[PDB]
Amino acid sequence: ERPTFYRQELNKTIWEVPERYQNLSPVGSGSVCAAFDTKTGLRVAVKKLSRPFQSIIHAKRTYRELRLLKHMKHENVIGLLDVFTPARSLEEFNDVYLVTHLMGADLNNIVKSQKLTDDHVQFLIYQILRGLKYIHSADIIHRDLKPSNLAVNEDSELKILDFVATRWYRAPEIMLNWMHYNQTVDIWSVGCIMAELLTGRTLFPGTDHIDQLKLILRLVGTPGAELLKKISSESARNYIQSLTQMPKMNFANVFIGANPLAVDLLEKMLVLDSDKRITAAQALAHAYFAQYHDPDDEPVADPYDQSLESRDLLIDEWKSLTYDEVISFVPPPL
Numbered sequence: 001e002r003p004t005f006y007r008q009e010l011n012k013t014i015w016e017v018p019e020r021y022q023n024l025s026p027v028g029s030g031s032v033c034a035a036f037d038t039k040t041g042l043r044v045a046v047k048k049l050s051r052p053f054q055s056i057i058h059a060k061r062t063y064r065e066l067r068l069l070k071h072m073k074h075e076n077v078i079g080l081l082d083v084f085t086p087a088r089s090l091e092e093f094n095d096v097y098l099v100t101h102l103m104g105a106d107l108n109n110i111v112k113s114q115k116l117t118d119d120h121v122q123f124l125i126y127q128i129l130r131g132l133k134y135i136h137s138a139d140i141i142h143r144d145l146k147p148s149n150l151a152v153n154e155d156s157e158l159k160i161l162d163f164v165a166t167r168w169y170r171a172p173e174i175m176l177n178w179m180h181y182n183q184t185v186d187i188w189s190v191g192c193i194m195a196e197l198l199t200g201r202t203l204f205p206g207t208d209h210i211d212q213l214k215l216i217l218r219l220v221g222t223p224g225a226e227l228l229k230k231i232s233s234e235s236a237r238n239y240i241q242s243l244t245q246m247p248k249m250n251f252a253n254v255f256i257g258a259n260p261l262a263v264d265l266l267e268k269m270l271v272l273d274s275d276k277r278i279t280a281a282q283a284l285a286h287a288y289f290a291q292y293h294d295p296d297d298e299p300v301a302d303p304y305d306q307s308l309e310s311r312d313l314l315i316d317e318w319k320s321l322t323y324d325e326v327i328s329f330v331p332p333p334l
């Protein structure tokens with residue numbers, strides 16, 4: 001039934017964890033301990049949520065985190081090994097712990113600013129897209145994909161996480177608060193990430209927000225005619241007007257001696273017009289990933305309720321709902 005729990009002090013707070021989890025050790029600030037799940041053999045990250053039910057917006061966040069994590073069932077996407085609470089009733093619920101695979105390094109810790117081989121980039125980017133295809137099939141946009149959101153083990157096996165200047169991988173529309181994003185915001189991010197692995201260099205290293213935008217326009221050129229027609233705001237329309245022409249650079253010269261398949265994929269991801277960017281499903285089918293591509297093991301998600309978290313409710317209802325998600329949780333198939 002319910003497992004036995006044990007208590008120990010950690011991070012200015014008492015952690016009450018099941019028995020099966022051992023040698024907890026703080027490895028970040030909620031706050032996280034690294035631990036060994038003796039039950040399963042795995043190294044895990046165990047997250048104690050700081051103040052999950054503080055406000056309407058915290059409680060809302062808790063419930064939405066749990067619900068997304070519980071929905072994420074894919075090799076290339078972080079997923080939940082366990083969720084627990086000491087509480088033996090709702091009356092007494094306030095503490096939430098999440099459990100997932102301990103990961104030792106992210107894509108800065110692999111990248112070491114050294115350029116990777118084509119075959120390695122192929123593999124890493126393949127996995128990102130495999131993972132993205134699936135997130136996107138759930139009508140989930142990630143919105144802030146970047147090396148530090150990309151977890152990787154010693155064998156180059158990758159997982160997308162939700163958690164370096166954090167703006168370098170952002171879709172330009174996000175930085176212009178465009179507010180009706182396509183899924184292809186993530187594709188922009190992958191493009192910048194891919195470019196970086198191949199070259200060893202940040203592709204758009206903006207020092208500030210506008211410089212960032214400036215570096216991008218150097219690469220792709222200025223909004224062409226068909227993109228310019230789409231600017232809702234007049235003044236942008238009008239400012240963007242007041243720029244001069246500058247034509248896209250030839251990526252082949254920007255990416256000197258890269259596999260031309262990679263260049264060609266870079267050219268389909270790094271299109272200003274989000275409506276013209278290659279999708280993840282399409283990019284997986286790109287001849288660049290011929291060695292990895294398999295259309296029968298690149299699985300979609302069950303659909304997922306975006307509005308069901310955007311309710312206006314009272315802390316007690318969020319907390320009751322989160323409680324129900326904690327109770328109903330069934331660990332993944334190992």
Ligand SMILES: NC(=O)c1c(OCc2c(F)cc(Br)cc2F)nsc1NC(=O)NCCCCN1CCCC1
Pocket residue numbers: 027028032044045046047069078079080081098099100101102103104105106150151161162163
């Ligand atoms: N995943 C992990 O191993 C991890 C982690 O997971 C939090 C966490 C949960 F606890 C539970 C759920 Br559910 C989701 C979730 F994101 N917080 S820190 C950390 N790993 C770590 O500090 N390794 C040693 C330092 C290397 C830098 N690494 C690269 C990747 C992460 C930082």
Ligand SMILES: CCCCCCCCO[C@@H]1O[C@H](CO)[C@@H](O)[C@H](O)[C@H]1O
Pocket residue numbers: 172173176178179180181182223227230240272273274275
């Ligand atoms: C300063 C001009 C550079 C920014 C151009 C960004 C164009 C991004 O693409 C735009 O994204 C929108 C979704 O957010 C779509 O609705 C538009 O149709 C699409 O053209």
